[PDB]
Amino acid sequence: KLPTPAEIVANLNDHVIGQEQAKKALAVSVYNHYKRLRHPKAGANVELSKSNILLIGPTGSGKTLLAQSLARKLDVPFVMADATTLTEAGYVGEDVEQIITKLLGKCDFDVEKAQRGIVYIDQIDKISRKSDNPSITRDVSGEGVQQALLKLIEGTVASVPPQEFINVDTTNILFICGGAFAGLEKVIRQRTEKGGIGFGASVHADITKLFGIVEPEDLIKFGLIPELIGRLPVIATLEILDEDALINILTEPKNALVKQYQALFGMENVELEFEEGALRSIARQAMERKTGARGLRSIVERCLLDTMYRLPDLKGLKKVVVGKAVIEEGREPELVF
Amino acid sequence: KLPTPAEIVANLNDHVIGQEQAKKALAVSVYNHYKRLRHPKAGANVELSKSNILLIGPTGSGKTLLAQSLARKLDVPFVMADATTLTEAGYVGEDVEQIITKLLGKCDFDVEKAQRGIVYIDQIDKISRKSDNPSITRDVSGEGVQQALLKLIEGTVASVPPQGGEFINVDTTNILFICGGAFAGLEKVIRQRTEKGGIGFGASVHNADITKLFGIVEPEDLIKFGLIPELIGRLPVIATLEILDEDALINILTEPKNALVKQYQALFGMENVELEFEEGALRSIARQAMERKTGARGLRSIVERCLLDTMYRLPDLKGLKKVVVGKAVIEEGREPELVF
Amino acid sequence: YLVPTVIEQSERAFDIYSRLLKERIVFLVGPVTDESANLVVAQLLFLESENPDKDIFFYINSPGGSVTAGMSIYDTMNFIKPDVSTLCLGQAASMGAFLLSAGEKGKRFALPNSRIMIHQPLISGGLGGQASDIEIHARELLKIKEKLNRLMAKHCDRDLADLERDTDRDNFMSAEEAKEYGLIDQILEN
Amino acid sequence: YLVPTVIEQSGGERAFDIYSRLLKERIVFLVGPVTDESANLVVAQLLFLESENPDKDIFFYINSPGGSVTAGMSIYDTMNFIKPDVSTLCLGQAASMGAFLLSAGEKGKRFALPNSRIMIHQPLISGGLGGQASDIEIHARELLKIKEKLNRLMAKHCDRDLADLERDTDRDNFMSAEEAKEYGLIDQILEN
């Protein structure tokens, strides 16, 4: 049978911490995707159209990680495209049909399976015309790609080179767009918060609360053409990771950062052990970098730099303990021989 | 014989909800074109210009539906082109002659039928003129496509590949062109032409009402948008689509063969759960979708985010038979009433 | 006084009061005169044209002034479409308190240590000449007195008899007393 | 007086009078008597600076012999309302409402220069007391309420009892920067 959305999320909880709304949206979309695939196509039955998703989240929130984790239990072809490599039809670069080309190459060019696949288009915010209005000049990397995707996101017939062009119907192909709309928080704040000067006016961020109230009007003001937003009905938002989520990210996931470094020290014969206050200090310091969970690596690498430098030289070392003072102060971790 | 405008619109109502003025305009123009071709006594001094149609309107207003319904009813060589794929002849992409090639393929390459068919071109607002380029080698995707398209819209002869792998000469004097697109800068162009306002006690002072703005479009406004004047002069008929109101959105939500309500009821029919919407729920869904400014496309987003906390649980909830979506589920953060 | 110049990023150089007018802030500072009241009227008319829907913020720090001058502001506030929110800074006395209470109901504010004073009008003009002239000016002053008390009673949701008692002599009120009276709706702190 | 013009280097040049140039650095001056017009300029500058940056401190330089209580209260309530801390500094003198606004600065950020003079006292006439005895009674009661309000707010600023401020503001109480620091009017004395 089909895996329920709860099971799909249970597969995502192993790699992604938090972001329950985005995981629930992705699970429901994949479940409805399967149901469309097995629904009868002809007869008195209504034809089910797809509901695409737009992943909006800050840097290091888990968009690409959500897609990679979802791709492990799909049972249908899947690719991760890059919008920064896309271009208009008449200019150099990859055309939007290369997305179908990659999805087709994943399945041995079996069109019947490629037409039932899922596509994740990363960096969808990097093709946004910053103008909010018609671009004064050809935006070959931006607005033009948005226009070329309208037929691709919706149902059309893609003509791609062979493995003699191949016709691929993109009507049942689910598209999951994602990107870190950096300047979107200012647009949402200007629309909702009555900012200004004087008493009775708002003075200024809370990117989580702002993204939780995002509307197509803000995405239009950011630089997405309304025709593309209308084809991305589901808008799943990812929250900025708090001090309590950044602690669980360090230890809980399958490929957690602490586990990665315990394995690096496992290539030697030395055990690496962290303390609770150490993990909390690492999370609170990474919070200040405004880089998401990517900042935890900058702290664990800075504090373990000298230790990893001396690790292959120290003989008889059996265990390294990283305390709270090692993070907040430039101390050396306790070496156990 | 020739389906009359009353018959044309009476069958456009089966697929397009609302936009009555545009359905009348398209039906009258198509009937006049076909009758004019059948009675070429207008060879007299009267130069009845080819009554091409420009179909402007917001996103999700039903441009691409009017084209398809007009196509499948008229029983005539009809092609749906996308200006996003069009390019200048000397560069990669589809030159404007591929449209005539598709028109021939739609009629078994019998050029006598293709020369009297219809050509629909979507997203024609995407090939507008722009300043000299960033992305500068040649503005290939822009004005060049407009000129190559103008050379077809006015009476010319195209050379296209044969029926098999000897080119065919196709005269497009009698081919009707219906161009459409969501001109996103047109409301600002019009609002600069007007919206003078005023100040003082005895002066009238005053979201853009793009409905009445689109209803007062002038050819010069489209020229400012980036369209060449010689193309607008060849598009005398301008059909405008209004923003779908609450009632039209409700009808779209329930009446069509592939309505959202029926789509989700069948989506729950893969399980054994009945889905039922209240009249107030449909009213609030239509209102919230109209507030998103995406047309009928903003209807699916509402119905999807209101049922998200339910589709996540349907396979886990056993004994469930019916789910009722009320006005509270749409307007408030409530859960639909589960009937076990 | 030297009015400071500030730079708005968009650069445009404003004096600080024109910069605040760009934010829909109108100041009534000092006595209410024909000239100071007409500047307020000019700003209220201008702001309605810029945006008839957005609130206008009318900051009042005034000991009073001419009744006719204050009435030009008052009728302009009520006429124009946008709500005129009023805020008492330092003091709103006499016609200043009248214009403060004249703000849109629910949007009349005062700062915590502001002083609000209401009272019957004094001379709207001298009473010289003959007894017939003095009778005329006395009757006109009484009509103004009744008109002010009637409009004040309407602003405060009180009876006309209450305003007639309370405006007999200078009635000084804290921000809390003015809120309880009905002159203002809220007291701002942060 | 001729206010000098200075040039600010930027990404180009912008010519300021020297006071607008210092306002760009979040420095607001209260110089001379506190009037409706001079107080409203301070309020306008405080409101403007909050919008430019709600988090950065505002530096309120005070060289004032006093002035109107209501005018000073417009500054006082604006200082307490706006989000950014208003640091106060006494240059030359802070007397009467000038000393009140000096003590009104953010606790820990109230400064005075080493030879500045700070004077606190009960208010004088907030307005004449003419007319009939009923009018004089009203104005006397209002002045007493202002006197109590000022002493109460001063006692709060200085972390002292209301009874202490009532004694010390009875007549003109002149204080050096050190005496004002010991009293609780200022927090620090600047030297370099």
Ligand SMILES: Nc1ncnc2c1ncn2[C@@H]1O[C@H](COP(=O)(O)OP(=O)(O)OP(=O)(O)O)[C@@H](O)[C@H]1O
């Ligand atoms: N919610 C999360 N749970 C677990 N790990 C996370 C999470 N968010 C980020 N990470 C860590 O950050 C790394 C990269 O994060 P990811 O690429 O998903 O961020 P992103 O949203 O794609 O950022 P950007 O928007 O800049 O592309 C991963 O290797 C992962 O270990």
Ligand SMILES: Nc1ncnc2c1ncn2[C@@H]1O[C@H](COP(=O)(O)OP(=O)(O)OP(=O)(O)O)[C@@H](O)[C@H]1O
């Ligand atoms: N007038 C209408 N009547 C019925 N359904 C409509 C109407 N307008 C939009 N829809 C619904 O919206 C969907 C797509 O609309 P359509 O593609 O016609 O909009 P469009 O004008 O092509 O938008 P765009 O200009 O962005 O391409 C259809 O599946 C249809 O169900």
Ligand SMILES: [Mg+2]
């Ligand atoms: Mg990524």
Ligand SMILES: [Mg+2]
């Ligand atoms: Mg379309």
